[PDB]
Design a protein around this ligand. Structure first.
Ligand SMILES: O=c1ccn([C@H]2C[C@H](O)[C@@H](COP(=O)(O)O)O2)c(=O)[nH]1
Lengths: 118, 126
């Protein structure tokens, strides 16, 4: 009955701010490692939008984004240039401005960016 | 083609700490096949083309990397044969998404020590 949102993230305060604001727009869907992987894959397939905070390098976040692209999901990636890091070319280079968006942001504005996207 | 096409993935923008090991792996992979591996878009598109051409995808997954994870996720969805190599001597716990993707056949994750990487590759490709 509500949109289904999937959040990926490797910072705790910013993650909590993002997850809390996502609840305005829908349900945020997000044993052993295999059971974790299969539950995450099931939630990815159910998701209407996949949101990832990509400032911290993470194999798991990258993997989730790769699976999400192959499932043809709408994807929003959020990067903080103030980190001083250069974002992976595989993530920056996947952006097409519509179905796969990569947005640079300053920490104070993250809720305004999500409101604009949703 | 004649030779198996091999795709190698390792951290770059996530960190170049293991660059010298990557060269040793690529050197041994060359024994068993052809190693195939707007600036960011061009890197993404060429890498995806090589990934699609690959018969085997080999990834060193010790250093956390968005790009290596992304390549592995696209490779799984392309139903590629995948070998991931992880070094427990790093002190790291490998991401559950990578460890949990392993099925022991088409997606394998092997723990190894740096000194045995040539013997590991010889066994996998035998
Ligand atoms: O500038 C580059 C060149 C290659 N790759 C591809 C090939 C590597 O296997 C992997 C490294 O990803 P990062 O560590 O740069 O995120 O992605 C990049 O992401 N960025």
């Amino acid at each position: 009955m509500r949109p289904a949102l999937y959040f990926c993230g490797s910072d705790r305060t910013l993650y909590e701010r993002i997850v809390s604001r996502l609840r305005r727009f829908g349900t945020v869907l997000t044993g052993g490692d295999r059971l974790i992987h299969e539950q995450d894959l099931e939630w990815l397939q159910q998701a209407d939008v996949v949101v990832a905070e990509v400032t911290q390098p993470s194999l798991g976040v990258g993997y989730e984004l790769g699976r999400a692209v192959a499932f043809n999901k709408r994807i929003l990636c959020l990067f903080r240039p103030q980190s001083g890091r250069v974002l992976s070319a595989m993530i920056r280079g996947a952006a097409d401005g519509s179905r796969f968006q990569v947005w640079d942001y300053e920490e104070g504005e993250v809720e305004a960016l999500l409101d604009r996207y949703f």
